[PDB]
Symmetry: C3
Subunit: 196 residues, 3 copies
Amino acid sequence: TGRPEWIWLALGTALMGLGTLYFLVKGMGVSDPDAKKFYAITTLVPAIAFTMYLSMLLGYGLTMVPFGGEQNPIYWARYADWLFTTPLLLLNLALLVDADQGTILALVGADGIMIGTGLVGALTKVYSYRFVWWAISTAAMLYILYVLFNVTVVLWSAYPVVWLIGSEGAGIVPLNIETLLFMVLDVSAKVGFGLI
Amino acid sequence: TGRPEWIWLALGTALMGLGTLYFLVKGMGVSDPDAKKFYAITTLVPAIAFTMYLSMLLGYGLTMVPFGGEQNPIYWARYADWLFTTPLLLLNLALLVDADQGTILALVGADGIMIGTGLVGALTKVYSYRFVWWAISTAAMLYILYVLFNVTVVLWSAYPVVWLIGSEGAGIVPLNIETLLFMVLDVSAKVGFGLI
Amino acid sequence: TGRPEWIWLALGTALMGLGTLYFLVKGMGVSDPDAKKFYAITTLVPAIAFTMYLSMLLGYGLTMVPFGGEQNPIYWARYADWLFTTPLLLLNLALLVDADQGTILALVGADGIMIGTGLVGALTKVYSYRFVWWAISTAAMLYILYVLFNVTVVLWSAYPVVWLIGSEGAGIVPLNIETLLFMVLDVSAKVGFGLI
Ligand SMILES: CC(C)CCCCCCCCCCCC[C@@H](C)CCCCCCCC(C)C
Ligand SMILES: CC(C)CCCCCCCCCCCC[C@@H](C)CCCCCCCC(C)C
Ligand SMILES: CC(C)CCCCCCCCCCCC[C@@H](C)CCCCCCCC(C)C
Ligand SMILES: *C\C=C(C)/C=C/C=C(C)/C=C/C1=C(C)CCCC1(C)C
Ligand SMILES: *C\C=C(C)/C=C/C=C(C)/C=C/C1=C(C)CCCC1(C)C
Ligand SMILES: *C\C=C(C)/C=C/C=C(C)/C=C/C1=C(C)CCCC1(C)C
């Protein structure tokens, strides 16, 4: 079909489904309560991402916010997916370092302004302001990364970079490739980090 | 007024209000903490449903997604209501069988993709895809019903059936009756199951 | 710029940022888990409010729902902000009076219908119904204030008053001043109550 990045969306869908299937199959037997918590969180993330990728694939989680004299396609379902998977991720990270609820709520709270503000950046029609939201979102990311303190850092910090050179940002790489880099980013975070 | 199913919406509003009133009155005296938790959850569900039904009654939680060559009315407030009442319900079911947070989060997590995906099915303009979302939502329902394991099963499984023959699905029964069957479904789940 | 209340939005942004900065700086050193919980909640509220005020300032969290023969500007980001800050607030109040989860969920549950219904009132195009939602929202406020039982009462009860004489309600004071009174209201609740 006519949308260059459909194949990256299609690859994304496939890899998220499969990994869900995989963590689902792998969850059985888990009776240890704690272990069940880890498993449920690890299974749910790609599940969610699977439905989000399918919606973008299907062209539903996509919309054309105008800016820079341009009518631009924006996959708002990306943010929809990060809104729910990133705090769960942190839930997992919180069990590792065994973080208090105090730490947890600020971590999860900083996380929501993060994706909430990038989605606002995503959807603003006044190009100049997009980066203000981008910087406020990036500033919340560093809070999280900072309380969270080696691969989450590099993995999470790459989203703001691809956004910035992305076609939602400076516009340095076409959408077809920005989509590509997010997919690779989402699969490693949703599936590999869960595998790892 | 001109919308055939307004009376089913009106009946729905009335029954949700009344039952709220009822569980509200019945909650007083509850000092036992656990009991308070059961009461709060049972009171809140119809409360929410009361406001959702009123909005659809008032014609506000309604919208006309086009598909099948048709401009179709879709009560998106139904999903808005299920998004919040169904996990609370499960909260209650979780206390019965005393389910771990592990079990609880997957149960509540499976539940959100469930209504999230049906709402997407609800709102897609490409008729063919509606059922793909319908099946992904139904597949999450069975996870829940399956971890949840005799009346929740029959009650919950009826939503996907009415959706399917519903005017949001195959279109086998007109909207005026699909609304009817959901109301009967929602009241028994929101009020009777709470009573029961 | 051309929107009379921009300065109240600008003042609002500034005061929310500063107080965030302030509670952020003040949070450091906190190792006591409980104390961390109080600090995280107190820091997060103005953070959120800071981004909401900026969006309204930037004219993004604003929209023009028509009613009374009029095309009216409605700052939906106000509700977006209350949706998340008010339950956190109550989280704090819950720690003071040390409220059970039972009490907590009804408190937080009543709170969501509250802002959810006012936003519906905010957005209905049939002027008459706006107040029905207003009264249902106000009725949920009194539940909260009532379980919550001296300044939260007066502070929280003022939102429904300014709404009512506000330009989203009876229209007794122009928007430029309704915005003013909410800002003063939000800063004292978001920052002063946190300071206090
Ligand atoms: C991995 C095992 C043991 C079970 C199978 C899991 C099911 C899903 C298969 C896809 C998993 C993803 C690979 C993990 C690592 C990442 C960095 C993700 C890279 C994604 C891009 C695809 C490139 C192809 C691959 C060699 C995986
Ligand atoms: C029931 C008691 C003890 C208190 C009163 C509760 C307040 C609400 C009244 C409505 C309650 C609903 C009935 C419970 C059972 C269900 C299967 C729901 C069926 C709904 C349809 C209406 C048909 C009429 C009735 C005979 C209730
Ligand atoms: C207050 C201390 C110790 C630290 C500084 C906090 C950072 C933010 C500064 C603004 C704080 C707000 C004042 C608290 C009280 C309120 C009732 C809010 C009133 C808001 C309106 C502005 C009027 C100016 C002021 C005198 C604050
Ligand atoms: C899917 C799994 C993870 C960990 C996804 C993480 C996403 C982010 C950290 C995205 C961050 C953004 C920032 C910091 C700034 C621009 C907007 C984004 C939401 C892309
Ligand atoms: C209101 C109380 C309950 C238990 C409501 C339950 C609703 C569902 C189980 C709805 C399920 C759907 C599915 C499985 C598929 C189509 C979309 C629906 C959301 C209608
Ligand atoms: C920002 C901090 C707090 C405590 C904000 C509180 C807001 C309210 C209590 C708002 C209440 C409303 C009601 C009761 C009726 C009309 C709609 C409103 C949401 C404005």
